[PDB]
Design an enzyme around this catalytic site. Structure first.
Site, PDB file in Angstrom:
ATOM      1  N   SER A   1      -4.276   2.599   1.892  1.00  0.00           N
ATOM      2  CA  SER A   1      -5.726   2.073   2.848  1.00  0.00           C
ATOM      3  C   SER A   1      -6.736   1.977   1.833  1.00  0.00           C
ATOM      4  CB  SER A   1      -6.101   3.418   3.858  1.00  0.00           C
ATOM      5  OG  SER A   1      -5.054   2.751   4.755  1.00  0.00           O
TER       6      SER A   1
ATOM      7  N   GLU B   1      -1.701  -5.310   7.429  1.00  0.00           N
ATOM      8  CA  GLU B   1      -0.331  -4.663   7.558  1.00  0.00           C
ATOM      9  C   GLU B   1       0.207  -4.713   9.032  1.00  0.00           C
ATOM     10  OE1 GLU B   1      -3.613  -1.419   5.616  1.00  0.00           O
ATOM     11  OE2 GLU B   1      -1.454  -1.272   6.854  1.00  0.00           O
TER      12      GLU B   1
ATOM     13  N   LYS C   1     -12.572   6.518   0.458  1.00  0.00           N
ATOM     14  CA  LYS C   1     -11.647   5.842   1.098  1.00  0.00           C
ATOM     15  C   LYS C   1      -9.898   6.541   0.825  1.00  0.00           C
ATOM     16  CE  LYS C   1     -10.015   3.330   4.015  1.00  0.00           C
ATOM     17  NZ  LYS C   1     -10.584   3.366   5.310  1.00  0.00           N
TER      18      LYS C   1
ATOM     19  N   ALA D   1      -2.549   7.476   2.731  1.00  0.00           N
ATOM     20  CA  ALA D   1      -0.968   7.676   3.289  1.00  0.00           C
ATOM     21  C   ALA D   1      -0.446   6.375   3.559  1.00  0.00           C
ATOM     22  CB  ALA D   1      -0.846   8.353   4.545  1.00  0.00           C
TER      23      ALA D   1
END
Length: 266
Positions: free
Chosen positions: A46, A142, A210, A213
């Site tokens: 991320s 993603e 920010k 994981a």
């Protein structure tokens, strides 16, 4: 020796978590910098979201896109962990609100919406090269970009590269003062990193951050901290290929963060 304790803490974590770990600290007040495995590659996970939203603002300034334009949310676009977007199926969301969502909650569908508006992984990588980042690269969207496998160059950065890029985005002039403040505020308003550097932040200090994981134990945080008496310090911490529990990886970040802050509060 100024960062001696930090180095010792990192070395202890490297052993206990049998992990690959890298750290970079940049002090904009006096031009000092320190790193441990700062040129090693780690999964962005991320932490790439900040770059995609920085590009939305940069592209908006050039007139390439309208941040107030809306994008239709279809049920088929939903990907894992999208708290904000999952409540707006069949509705339209502005690119600016998609950036607010992904920067403050890490909503993954929101991130894919932004990527689709700024040229995808390729546009993001090209933007990084333009700002002088020769290492960071985004290749997938993603959720695939979180794979985190050893030796995979896709969706990776180095602690030093991303710290430098954040320094440029927030404090250089690639973005207007208004957009720097907007990007910084999105990070300051992050709601999902209370268990990391924020938990050890010195009294009176501020933080814009920010985290991420991913697969094979990937864990990371890119933050900017400052106070009335200390100009921005950029901190980049990445862990990869470890079997450690999320609690242990958070513990590593909190210990390292604590030692870094001690360098500047002592």
């Amino acid at each position: 020796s100024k960062f001696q304790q930090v180095e010792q803490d990192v070395k202890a974590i490297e052993v206990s978590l049998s992990a690959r770990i890298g750290v970079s600290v940049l002090d904009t007040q006096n031009g000092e910098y320190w790193d441990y495995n700062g040129n090693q590659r780690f999964p962005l996970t991320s932490t790439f979201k900040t770059i995609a939203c920085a590009k939305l603002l940069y592209d908006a300034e050039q007139g390439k896109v309208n941040p107030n334009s809306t994008v239709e949310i279809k049920k088929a676009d939903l990907v894992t962990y999208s708290p904000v977007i999952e409540k707006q199926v069949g509705q339209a969301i502005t690119l600016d609100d998609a950036c607010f969502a992904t920067m403050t909650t890490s909503d993954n569908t929101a991130a894919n919406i932004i990527l689709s508006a700024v040229g995808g992984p390729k546009g993001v990588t090209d933007f990084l090269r333009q700002i002088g980042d020769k290492e960071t690269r985004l290749d997938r969207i993603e959720p695939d970009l979180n794979e985190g496998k050893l030796g995979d160059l896709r969706d990776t950065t180095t602690p030093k590269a991303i710290a430098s890029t954040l320094n440029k985005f927030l404090f250089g002039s690639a973005l207007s003062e208004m957009n720097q403040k907007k990007l910084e505020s999105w990070m300051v308003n992050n709601q999902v990193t209370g268990n990391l550097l924020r938990s050890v932040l010195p009294a009176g200090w501020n933080i814009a951050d920010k985290s991420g994981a991913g697969g094979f134990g990937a864990r990371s945080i890119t933050a900017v901290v400052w106070s009335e008496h200390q100009a921005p310090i950029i901190v980049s911490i990445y862990l990869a290929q470890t079997q450690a529990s999320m609690e242990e990886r958070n513990d590593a970040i909190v210990k390292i963060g604590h030692s870094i802050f001690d360098v500047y509060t002592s």
